[PDB]
C-alpha cells in the first residue's frame, strides 16, 4: 500500500515543505554547481 503510506505521510511532508519555503533551503544556498 505505497499509496496509503504517501497518504498517511502527506501532512508530515507538507509541513516540512512549508517550513523550508518559510525558512529557506540549505541545498540551494550551498550547492556546488
Amino acid at each position: 500500500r505505497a499509496e496509503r503510506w504517501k497518504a498517511e505521510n502527506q501532512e508530515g511532508m507538507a509541513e516540512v515543505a512549508r517550513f523550508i519555503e518559510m525558512n529557506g533551503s540549505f541545498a540551494d544556498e550551498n550547492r556546488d554547481w
Binding site: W5, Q10, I20, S25, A27, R31, W33
Partner: protein
C-alpha cells in the same frame, strides 16, 4: 520520477551539466524537492573519473559521466524537461551512491 533523465534548463550550468538524473524514491514524490545527480559529457573531461563512483552512461544524448559526488537536492520545479529514462542503470546508480557513503 526515479531514474528519469532531465535536460538542464539553466544556461549557466548546462554546458558542464547538460542533464541530471532523478535518484529519489517514487515513494517520496510528494516532496517538492528531488535528490538528483548531474551528468557531464566525456568530451569535456580532463582526467578519468573513478568508474565505481562515477559510472559511464551511454545514451542517445551521448556518453556521459555520472558525477555522483555532486548529488544534490533541487526544487522539483527544475525537473521541467524529461528527455530519457535510465532505469536499466538502476543497480549501478544505486551502487554508486552507496559507494559514496560507505566506500563499498
Amino acid at each position: 520520477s526515479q531514474f528519469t533523465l532531465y535536460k538542464n534548463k539553466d544556461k549557466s550550468s548546462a554546458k558542464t551539466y547538460p542533464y541530471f538524473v532523478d535518484v529519489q524514491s517514487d515513494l517520496l514524490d510528494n516532496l517538492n524537492t528531488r535528490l538528483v545527480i548531474p551528468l557531464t559529457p566525456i568530451e569535456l573531461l580532463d582526467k578519468k573519473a573513478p568508474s565505481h563512483l562515477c559510472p559511464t552512461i551511454h545514451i542517445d544524448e551521448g556518453d556521459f559521466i555520472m558525477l555522483t559526488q555532486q548529488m544534490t537536492s533541487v526544487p522539483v520545479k527544475i525537473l521541467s524537461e524529461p528527455v530519457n529514462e535510465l532505469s536499466t542503470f538502476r543497480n549501478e546508480i544505486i551502487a554508486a551512491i552507496d559507494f559514496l557513503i560507505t566506500g563499498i
